[PDB]
Design a protein around this ligand. Structure first.
Ligand SMILES: C[N+](C)(CCO)Cc1cn(-c2cc(C(=O)O)nc(C(=O)O)c2)nn1
Ligand SMILES: C[N+](C)(CCO)Cc1cn(-c2cc(C(=O)O)nc(C(=O)O)c2)nn1
Ligand SMILES: C[N+](C)(CCO)Cc1cn(-c2cc(C(=O)O)nc(C(=O)O)c2)nn1
Ligand SMILES: [Cl-]
Ligand SMILES: [Cl-]
Ligand SMILES: [Cl-]
Ligand SMILES: [Cl-]
Ligand SMILES: [Cl-]
Ligand SMILES: [Cl-]
Ligand SMILES: [Cl-]
Ligand SMILES: [Cl-]
Ligand SMILES: [Eu+3]
Ligand code: NA
Ligand code: NA
Length: 129
């Protein structure tokens, strides 16, 4: 599923991601745009042979099982494919664990480089939330 901007903002808010660990909703929307272009089916292979999955490009090295990242963890206790669903529940619940692990949203490279320190509220401008 490719979400619209406000559609994704509303889904993220409903799932409690707005202000989670102090990160306003615009931070999450900005991160998703640059990680996945709002596409739940996005996948990308990393140099170490792990893969990033879904709207927030969650890494099989640590967070989900894909059966082909030997030596990795599955800290969200989910198959990576669950992170590709049109329903973002699994991605949100896993993202909550990720952002809580000590490094906040810096775990998302695209967030650090493209969203951090910018006017992130612009990402939800005009939405009825
Ligand atoms: C109309 N649908 C497809 C379904 C019903 O909400 C939602 C939707 C809205 N989309 C959208 C697409 C785009 C765009 O492609 O730039 N932009 C926005 C926006 O708010 O800036 C929103 N993409 N999908
Ligand atoms: C009119 N320009 C801006 C320039 C050339 O005609 C092109 C253009 C861009 N459009 C557009 C429209 C929308 C939108 O309506 O959501 N979103 C985007 C986007 O990048 O998110 C871009 N619609 N037309
Ligand atoms: C204004 N910047 C800084 C632009 C950065 O790329 C952030 C931004 C982008 N926004 C935006 C604006 C629009 C729009 O107005 O159509 N659409 C989208 C979209 O994803 O479809 C995204 N809203 N805020
Ligand atoms: Cl914030
Ligand atoms: Cl915001
Ligand atoms: Cl594996
Ligand atoms: Cl393979
Ligand atoms: Cl699993
Ligand atoms: Cl959803
Ligand atoms: Cl933090
Ligand atoms: Cl920020
Ligand atoms: Eu648009
Ligand atoms: Na992999
Ligand atoms: Na794994």
């Amino acid at each position: 599923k490719v979400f619209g901007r406000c559609e994704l903002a509303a889904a993220m808010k409903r799932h409690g991601l707005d202000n989670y660990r102090g990160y306003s909703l615009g931070n999450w929307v900005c991160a998703a745009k640059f990680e996945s272009n709002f596409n739940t089916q996005a996948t990308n292979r990393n140099t170490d042979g792990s893969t990033d999955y879904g709207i927030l490009q969650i890494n099989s090295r640590w967070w989900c099982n894909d059966g082909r990242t030997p030596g990795s963890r599955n800290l969200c206790n989910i198959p990576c494919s669950a992170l590709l669903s049109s329903d973002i529940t699994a991605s949100v619940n896993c993202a909550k664990k990720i952002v809580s692990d000590g490094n906040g949203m810096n775990a998302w490279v695209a967030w650090r480089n493209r969203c951090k320190g910018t006017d992130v509220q612009a990402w939800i401008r005009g939405c009825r939330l």
